Design a binder for these strands. Sequence first.
RNA 1: AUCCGGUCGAUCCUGCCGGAGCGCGACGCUCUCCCCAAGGACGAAGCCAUGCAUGCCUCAGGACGCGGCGGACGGCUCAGGACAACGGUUGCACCCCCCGUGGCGGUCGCCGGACACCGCUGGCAACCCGGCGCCAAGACGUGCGCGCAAGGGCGGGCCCCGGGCGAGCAGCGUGACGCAGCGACGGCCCGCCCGGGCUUCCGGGGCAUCACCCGGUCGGCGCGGUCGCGGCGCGCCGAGGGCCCGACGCCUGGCGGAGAAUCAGGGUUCGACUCCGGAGAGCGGGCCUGCGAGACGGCCCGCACAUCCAAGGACGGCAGCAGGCGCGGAACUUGCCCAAUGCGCGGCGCGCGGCGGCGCGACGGGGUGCGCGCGAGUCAGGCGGG
RNA 2: GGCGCUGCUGCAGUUGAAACGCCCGUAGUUGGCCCCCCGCCGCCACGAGGAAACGGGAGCGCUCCAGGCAGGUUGGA
Lengths: 258, 109, 181, 163, 166
Amino acid sequence: ARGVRKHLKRLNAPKHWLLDKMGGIWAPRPTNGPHGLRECIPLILILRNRLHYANTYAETSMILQDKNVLIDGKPRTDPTFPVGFMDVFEIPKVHKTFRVLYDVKGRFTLVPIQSNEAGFKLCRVQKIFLGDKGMPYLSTHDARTIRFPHPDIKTNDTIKINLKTGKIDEWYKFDIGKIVMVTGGRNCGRIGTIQAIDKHMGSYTMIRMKDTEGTEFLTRLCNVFVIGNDSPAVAIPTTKGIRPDIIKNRELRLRSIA
Amino acid sequence: KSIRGCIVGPDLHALSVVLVDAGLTDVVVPKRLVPKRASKIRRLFGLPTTKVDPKDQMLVCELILKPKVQRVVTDEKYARKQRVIAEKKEIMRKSLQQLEEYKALLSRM
Amino acid sequence: RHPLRPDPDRERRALERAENLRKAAYEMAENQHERAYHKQSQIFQGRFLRKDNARCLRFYKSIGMGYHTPITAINGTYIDKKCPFTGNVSIRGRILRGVVHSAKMQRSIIVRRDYLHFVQKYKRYERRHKHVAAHLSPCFRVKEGDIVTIGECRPLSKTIRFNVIKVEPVSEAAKKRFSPF
Amino acid sequence: GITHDKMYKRSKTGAVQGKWHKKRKYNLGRQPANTKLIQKISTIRCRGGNIKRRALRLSHGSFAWGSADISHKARILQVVYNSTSNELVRTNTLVKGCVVQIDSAPFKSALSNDTLDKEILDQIRGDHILARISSRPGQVGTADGYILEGPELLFYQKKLAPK
Amino acid sequence: PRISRHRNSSKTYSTPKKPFTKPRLDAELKLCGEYGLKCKREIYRARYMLAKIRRTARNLLTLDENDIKRRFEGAALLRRLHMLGILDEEKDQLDYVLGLRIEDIFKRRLQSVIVESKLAKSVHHARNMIKARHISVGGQIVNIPSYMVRISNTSRVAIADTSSLA
RNA sequence: AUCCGGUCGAUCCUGCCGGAGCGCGACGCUCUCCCCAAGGACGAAGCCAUGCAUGCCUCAGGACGCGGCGGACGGCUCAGGACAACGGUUGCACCCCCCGUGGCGGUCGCCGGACACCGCUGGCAACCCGGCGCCAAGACGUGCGCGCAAGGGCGGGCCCCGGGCGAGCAGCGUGACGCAGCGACGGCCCGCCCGGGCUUCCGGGGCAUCACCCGGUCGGCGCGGUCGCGGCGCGCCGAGGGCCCGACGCCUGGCGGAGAAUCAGGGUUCGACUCCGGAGAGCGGGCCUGCGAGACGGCCCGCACAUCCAAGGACGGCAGCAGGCGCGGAACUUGCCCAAUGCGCGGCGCGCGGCGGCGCGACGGGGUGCGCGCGAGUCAGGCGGG
RNA sequence: GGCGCUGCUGCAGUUGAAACGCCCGUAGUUGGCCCCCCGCCGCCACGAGGAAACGGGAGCGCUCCAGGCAGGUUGGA
Ligand SMILES: [K+]
Ligand SMILES: [K+]
Ligand SMILES: [K+]
Ligand SMILES: [K+]
Ligand SMILES: [K+]
Ligand SMILES: [K+]
Ligand SMILES: [K+]
Ligand SMILES: [K+]
Ligand SMILES: [K+]
Ligand SMILES: [K+]
Ligand SMILES: [K+]
Ligand SMILES: [K+]
Ligand SMILES: [K+]
Ligand SMILES: [K+]
Ligand SMILES: [K+]
Ligand SMILES: [K+]
Ligand SMILES: [K+]
Ligand SMILES: [K+]
Ligand SMILES: [K+]
Ligand SMILES: [K+]
Ligand SMILES: [K+]
Ligand SMILES: [K+]
Ligand SMILES: [K+]
Ligand SMILES: [K+]
Ligand SMILES: [K+]
Ligand SMILES: [K+]
Ligand SMILES: [K+]
Ligand SMILES: [K+]
Ligand SMILES: [K+]
Ligand SMILES: [K+]
Ligand SMILES: [K+]
Ligand SMILES: [K+]
Ligand SMILES: [K+]
Ligand SMILES: [K+]
Ligand SMILES: [K+]
Ligand SMILES: [K+]
Ligand SMILES: [K+]
Ligand SMILES: [K+]
Ligand SMILES: [K+]
Ligand SMILES: [K+]
Ligand SMILES: [K+]
Ligand SMILES: [K+]
Ligand SMILES: [K+]
Ligand SMILES: [K+]
Ligand SMILES: [K+]
Ligand SMILES: [K+]
Ligand SMILES: [K+]
Ligand SMILES: [K+]
Ligand SMILES: [K+]
Ligand SMILES: [K+]
Ligand SMILES: [K+]
Ligand SMILES: [K+]
Ligand SMILES: [K+]
Ligand SMILES: [K+]
Ligand SMILES: [K+]
Ligand SMILES: [K+]
Ligand SMILES: [K+]
Ligand SMILES: [K+]
Ligand SMILES: [K+]
Ligand SMILES: [K+]
Ligand SMILES: [K+]
Ligand SMILES: [K+]
Ligand SMILES: [K+]
Ligand SMILES: [K+]
Ligand SMILES: [K+]
Ligand SMILES: [K+]
Ligand SMILES: [K+]
Ligand SMILES: [K+]
Ligand SMILES: [K+]
Ligand SMILES: [K+]
Ligand SMILES: [K+]
Ligand SMILES: [K+]
Ligand SMILES: [K+]
Ligand SMILES: [K+]
Ligand SMILES: [K+]
Ligand SMILES: [K+]
Ligand SMILES: [K+]
Ligand SMILES: [K+]
Ligand SMILES: [K+]
Ligand SMILES: [K+]
Ligand SMILES: [K+]
Ligand SMILES: [K+]
Ligand SMILES: [K+]
Ligand SMILES: [K+]
Ligand SMILES: [K+]
Ligand SMILES: [K+]
Ligand SMILES: [K+]
Ligand SMILES: [K+]
Ligand SMILES: [K+]
Ligand SMILES: [K+]
Ligand SMILES: [K+]
Ligand SMILES: [Mg+2]
Ligand SMILES: [Mg+2]
Ligand SMILES: [Mg+2]
Ligand SMILES: [Mg+2]
Ligand SMILES: [Mg+2]
Ligand SMILES: [Mg+2]
Ligand SMILES: [Mg+2]
Ligand SMILES: [Mg+2]
Ligand SMILES: [Mg+2]
Ligand SMILES: [Mg+2]
Ligand SMILES: [Mg+2]
Ligand SMILES: [Mg+2]
């Protein structure tokens, strides 16, 4: 081409969006922002496609013009705004507060949370670097920037941020035996404990985890998010990160029409 | 494009000319539009352009669509600018405090 | 670096390599066949006039990945901006091994890499080879048949993207074999 | 126009290669400054903005005697030697790395301290000092350098021997 | 493009390789006599629908009795074959699938079911009655002679309450 | 997981010729009902009449105009190009990047004048323009401010090995230059994000009646140029580089993949067109504006073709949507609409796309009876639909 | 596809078409037996990571069907 892409065909949209192949040539293209294109969901795809508060695009706009939706405590008036992992989703007029996590099939789900919990956010430290006049900065998985961080915080740790001041009140270190959740790949969405860290000079570092039923699995270090120290700092869905096999899933499916 | 039929010669079907230092000049046409910038109405009326009462909302114009004077320093606009300056100082003060905290922290560590 | 410097008492004498490097530098100044004066960019050239010895006269570095710097580079007198130990380049990307096909160029060699290609219809293999150009620092010397390990760098010429970082000698007059590795 | 695209070169076996597109804008090159000695600097718009300064007709520079650390601003007097071509010396064209003669006046206040190179003090006692340009005048519009010393000084002094 | 370009379609029958073979030529018309078949295509369809369920079983039977693919797909195949009544409950072995014939498929047609319960005197009268919207399945009026009736929905085949025969 | 007819006076073989199945087009004949659905690609990337395909929001009743964002995305085609492109797999410690989302914000008293819309006059066949004059800004221009943009000299250890690495990388100090950007409604700058540029390894057509090929060709040194590395270019130095594990040359009615047709297993053939990537806009070149183009519903030139004209001049690009000519065996309406799916500005726009029309390319279901009730049609009301 | 008349699985070469007049010989292809419990290839298995549509395939009566992703706590494994 001669410049950036502004469209996204429906068959080319990410597969965990669960878009259906009829009823449209086009799909919404997420605007740049706190999250990337592949690992996100356009906000409209929650209000219209999922919760049916709106039923078309045009009337999905008017909900976001009068500012009925807060993301991390701020009203976003943009239908293709990228919302993603750990974002707080609060609709006041219906009194619904959610936290955006993954389910055991790598898709985004909303978990109900209490008013005592929606005032903070977990971020993953992506890098530490020296900015202007040699000052230290840290960057997160949300495209957030913090100057003068405490020297203990190192890369791959997670930090806890109050959602009004935008400052740090807690941090969790990446270690052996920490509770963790996988954010992408093919073990996305399930929760376990770290039991190995194998570094390969020049190449990717692999992590081996083990579920609460003891199933062991592997992935890359760029996909493991710490959610606490042997106890998750937040709430998690009812399945709690245990993935069935196809046979047990089939028997649970047979039981729904039963 | 194509240009310049002559440096005036026989070709031209038209000429444009202005009169300097004067059939004879008789008509005097009025100026349709009136000064609009705030200073434009202080040079007209000899008023100084430096005071703490520059409001100048005299409304005559001789009923001659055009007024809505520009560049007027009102009271709220003065407050706006003063507020922006008072916040551009607060940023620097809090920034220097944070730098001091971090230097002392590394000193303790 | 927890441990600190055990005690030999011939160290300061053995730093006569300083006068060594110094007189090599002053020999480069007399070869008036050259057009440019060659020097490392990491080194002042005012450190040679001094006598207190307090400052180093040659620059070198480590390349990582468990590959140690040869002493011939640390105590050499050559100038090479493309040497991975004493020049201005870096190693990153793929690391490979091969055999020296030809050493007829100026600080450049050809490397022969061998491999197998499976053809499924016939259920069999064919032997294949490719040639790769690589840069040769003076801190190594090689001949045809020797095994080398090369590592990827930024583009360096029309054909070169690798740099010799290890040598395994092979005796002359031995049967040449496929030798894939 | 001028391009640094590789599509016009033969392969490494000597074979001619075909053309599969027309010239792209991002592969352009421009003409060189050919900065003259003894003041204009033009501005060039580049990719994404990113102004480039391109010098024509520079006169002065800022120079450093590194060993004793005496830095002044001095006038470049003459280009005396160049490695690439003797055509670039005959014309007094300012490029990176060329050897010049600079004015000795600003450094005459450094004539007192001894234990300072006599191969530099005797240079100062005359009219000029041998120095080397260290910047790219076509890319930043500036011509600064350092004062030669060590075996480098001797190498260039024999290159300019009265022979 | 248009959206219709993304719609799928498929052929659902296979024609025989030698057309002019006498014994299957008359065996193919005894079938058109015992069932009110319009034309040979409705036989071809049947054989095609057999040839797939025969291909699955022979793939799983080559496997091992404890593999998950057998445990999953063979159970799915048997559970599907028991609801349509193409296979009966007493044969719950994957090896009982291979000895199946077309007639087992033809016996679960609505045209055949209504003949069995004697709603129609013959199969031709049954086809005519089907076209006349005179018969309902579970309170739902079904117009298709070729309709396949599940064993759940075979207790509940009647004349439609709205009808001229009510 | 199948064969059958044809050589003889008769017989057993080798061996081909012919028949029997599926798919894709074209031709012929014929056709009741309903659902789905391709449709000028096929050595003419030949030529085009006409209309439509890109607009939407700081300073006065409104227009108009100025200013701003977008027009580089979307649509079409397969001409070129065979160690390309393209597919998987690496890297940038050789790079650039609008919007959006976090940060950050220290810089050696309210200014000026003038341009368009518009008035008064004109030229010209028409295309298109001239002169004089009153008038604004979230437009310019200059700037009030706690010094800090680029580039440059010194600040490393002389077995071997945190700010941040596998890797001496990034910052800072200190001597010299320089005076950039942001400030008249406060933003220069920094991280991410998407996108791009190149780049490592493996795969990547046929012909030997094409056996030797190349000479910026292969490497080195130094400068220039570039967003940036690089024989990318230039000066100098050396003689390298590729090849029967098929180089070089020539040919292709050659776009690549995801895939598709056929059918025991192993295979054979095709990849115009839906998604992804590439390239082009009659053919060569050149360029401006912009974050982004070597843009063609932008500009300039040569060539080959057309257009209007008072003869002075002016002027064009359907491989966009319909439509036409030509060519061919071979391919549809010069319809209605932004209601949906999405994109730009926020309310509109949009031949993207949607809905009807023509449509036996092809798919799927049901009829022309049964032992006596239906469907195809007709007329009304619903439902659906901008 | 038939065609084992292109043959890797899997053709034919005494007489049906087909073994160079013969010997040497480089590239290529191929190479007896033996030590087990190290390294480096190949090879087998299991993982990680990257695209959907197509192709398989779990569940669901568009009246059936070619379809589609529905639906009555759900689901698109
Ligand atoms: K394209
Ligand atoms: K762009
Ligand atoms: K664009
Ligand atoms: K699509
Ligand atoms: K679609
Ligand atoms: K599409
Ligand atoms: K968008
Ligand atoms: K060196
Ligand atoms: K191999
Ligand atoms: K291979
Ligand atoms: K081989
Ligand atoms: K080179
Ligand atoms: K080169
Ligand atoms: K071999
Ligand atoms: K160019
Ligand atoms: K370009
Ligand atoms: K066969
Ligand atoms: K015969
Ligand atoms: K005979
Ligand atoms: K015969
Ligand atoms: K055509
Ligand atoms: K064509
Ligand atoms: K053809
Ligand atoms: K054809
Ligand atoms: K045509
Ligand atoms: K723009
Ligand atoms: K444009
Ligand atoms: K078309
Ligand atoms: K093509
Ligand atoms: K852009
Ligand atoms: K590459
Ligand atoms: K490569
Ligand atoms: K490559
Ligand atoms: K390759
Ligand atoms: K050939
Ligand atoms: K040359
Ligand atoms: K060069
Ligand atoms: K040259
Ligand atoms: K030469
Ligand atoms: K060949
Ligand atoms: K063609
Ligand atoms: K097969
Ligand atoms: K074969
Ligand atoms: K096969
Ligand atoms: K076969
Ligand atoms: K088509
Ligand atoms: K295409
Ligand atoms: K295509
Ligand atoms: K596409
Ligand atoms: K595409
Ligand atoms: K594309
Ligand atoms: K394309
Ligand atoms: K293109
Ligand atoms: K072209
Ligand atoms: K053209
Ligand atoms: K052209
Ligand atoms: K052209
Ligand atoms: K052109
Ligand atoms: K670009
Ligand atoms: K050009
Ligand atoms: K061009
Ligand atoms: K037209
Ligand atoms: K075409
Ligand atoms: K149309
Ligand atoms: K014709
Ligand atoms: K005709
Ligand atoms: K619309
Ligand atoms: K935009
Ligand atoms: K349309
Ligand atoms: K009736
Ligand atoms: K009726
Ligand atoms: K055959
Ligand atoms: K075959
Ligand atoms: K066969
Ligand atoms: K044989
Ligand atoms: K013969
Ligand atoms: K013969
Ligand atoms: K013969
Ligand atoms: K023989
Ligand atoms: K022979
Ligand atoms: K022989
Ligand atoms: K022999
Ligand atoms: K022999
Ligand atoms: K041999
Ligand atoms: K061999
Ligand atoms: K062989
Ligand atoms: K061999
Ligand atoms: K042998
Ligand atoms: K293997
Ligand atoms: K995708
Ligand atoms: K649930
Ligand atoms: Mg496009
Ligand atoms: Mg082009
Ligand atoms: Mg001279
Ligand atoms: Mg030579
Ligand atoms: Mg293809
Ligand atoms: Mg294709
Ligand atoms: Mg077409
Ligand atoms: Mg265009
Ligand atoms: Mg063009
Ligand atoms: Mg014809
Ligand atoms: Mg039907
Ligand atoms: Mg065969």
